[PDB]
Amino acid sequence: MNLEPYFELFINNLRRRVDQLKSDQSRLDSELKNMQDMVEDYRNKYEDEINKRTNAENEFVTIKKDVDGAYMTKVDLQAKLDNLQQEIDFLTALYQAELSQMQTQIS
Amino acid sequence: MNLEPYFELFINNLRRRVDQLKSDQSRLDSELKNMQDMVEDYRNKYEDEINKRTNAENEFVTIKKDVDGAYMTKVDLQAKLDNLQQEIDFLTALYQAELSQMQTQIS
Amino acid sequence: GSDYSKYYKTIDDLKNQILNLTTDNANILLQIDNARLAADDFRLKYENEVALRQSVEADINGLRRVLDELTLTKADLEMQIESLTEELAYLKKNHEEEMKDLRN
Amino acid sequence: GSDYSKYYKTIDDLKNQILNLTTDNANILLQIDNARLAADDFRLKYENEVALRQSVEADINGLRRVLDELTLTKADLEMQIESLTEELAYLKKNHEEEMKDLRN
């Protein structure tokens, strides 16, 4: 029969299309494997950085509490010191005045 | 007694310090009220933007699903169409060849 | 003297009033500081939120344009498929009929 | 003819093989796309994380410097308070003793 090569040509075209699509599929498989691998890598990085951040925040909380306490202690100590100095000076002047008062009052 | 004004002076100094510290306290009260008010405002903004973001993410998920489906339908339809065209052409040529085959084969 | 004793009482009352006022004001200042840090922290968190939402929404709009394009394409393809299907069926049956005719 | 029928079978098998391959590859491409968006999304989230951590840690170091300064200051003040306390007590008792002396 005359028409065998018509069929063989059309089959050849279909075969070419199939083979291209199979190659494409292999490429897409590799590409998806690379991408998924990336998703896992960046996911891991993200989570680890969450934990590092959280520990940093907690550490900050602790040290800021310590600082607040230290500032309160410094404030109170400075107030006590200022009171001591002021009272020393006042009592110095006043007491010298008492000595005068006594030497003159005796007369 | 001579030394009343010494005491009155020191008392005056202490009174001045007290009054300054009271004024300072009033200012600090106002300042803390302003700050707390800000903390509430920015907290509210933050939370509302969380909710807006979340709704945006969900909406995105939905529309991306719809797009994926639409792309799959387009792919399949395009494949079916290409098949139809290719088969039409092939059958056209082949059938004309069958007509020739018959007119010559009869002879 | 007695009078001097009274003056002493007032002195000490003012000393303690100072101490109390300094401590209280220090505590208030710490409240202000921590509240500051909290406001700034909430503004950073918020900024991150508007960034994430920015990317999301922009991507959404893009995907709306894509979806419209894909739907229009789908309708078009359905039309074309219909036409080519009718045409193919015609072709097949017509050729077969011609075969019958020439064989008779 | 029979032979032509066999060829037909192969043809249709290839047509369906095409359809299957196109669909499968499309699904894989969608998987790749969504995975892309997920990787990019995780990198944005991560970047935000390193920003927050940046602010936190820097603030920490600053607060370490402050804490050291405050502790050193505290020790210094304690020393000064001690000295001035001894000095005040001396002053008071000495003046009182002098009073006793002059009165005698």
Smallest Cα–Cα separation from D44: which of B50, B67, C49?
C49
C interface mutation test: which of D19, D36, D43, D48 has the most C CBs within 10 A?
D48
Smallest Cα–Cα separation from C42: which of B48, A56, D57?
B48
Cβ pair C25, B25 in contact under 8 A: yes
Nearest to C55 among D44, D51, D52 (CB): D44
Q: In one letter, which amino acid is A104?
A: T
> Residue A46 in 3-state DSSP?
helix
C-alpha angle A41-A47-A49 in degrees, rounded to nearest 5: 100
Instruction: State the first-to-last Cα distance of chain A, in angstroms, to the nearest integer.
Output: 159
What's the Cα-to-Cα distance from D37 to each of B72, C56, D11, D28, D34, rounded to whole Å?
Answer: 18, 11, 39, 14, 5
What gap in Å lies between CA A75 and CA A77, rounded to an integer?
Answer: 6
* Structural domains in chain A (count): 1
Smallest Cα–Cα separation from D35: which of C52, A29, A27, B75?
A29
Close Cβ partners of C13 (under 8 Å, ≥ 6 residues apart): none
What gap in Å lies between CA A14 and CA B83, rounded to an integer?
Answer: 10
What gap in Å lies between CA C65 and CA C63, rounded to an integer?
Answer: 5
D interface mutation test: which of A4, A32, A76, A105 has the most D CBs within 10 A?
A32
Name the residue ranges covered by the structural domains of chain D: 1-104
- What single string gives the DSSP state of each residue in B33-88? HHHHHHHHHHHHHHHHHHHHHHHHHHHHHHHHHHHHHHHHHHHHHHHHHHHHHHHH
Range of the domain at A106: 1-107
Which pair of structure tokens corresponds to residue D78? Answer: 């304690």
D38 shares contact with chain B (CB less than 8 Å): no
What gap in Å lies between CA B34 and CA B43, rounded to an integer?
Answer: 14
Close Cβ partners of D64 (under 8 Å, ≥ 6 residues apart): A63
Q: In one letter, which amino acid is A57?
A: E
What gap in Å lies between CA B91 and CA C91, rounded to an integer?
Answer: 8
Residue tagged 């920003």 (tokens): D51
What gap in Å lies between CA A68 and CA D58, rounded to an integer?
Answer: 18
**Annotated resolution, angstroms:** 2.4
Method: X-ray
CB atoms within 10 A of CB A77: 18
Which pair of structure tokens corresponds to residue A21? Answer: 């699509």
Query: Percentage helix, strand, coil, to 5, in chain A?
Result: 95, 0, 5
Which pair of structure tokens corresponds to residue D100? Answer: 């006793």
What gap in Å lies between CA B57 and CA B51, rounded to an integer?
Answer: 10
Q: In one letter, which amino acid is C5?
A: S
Smallest Cα–Cα separation from C41: which of B42, A87, A105, D21?
B42
- The H-assigned helical ranges of chain C are 2-103
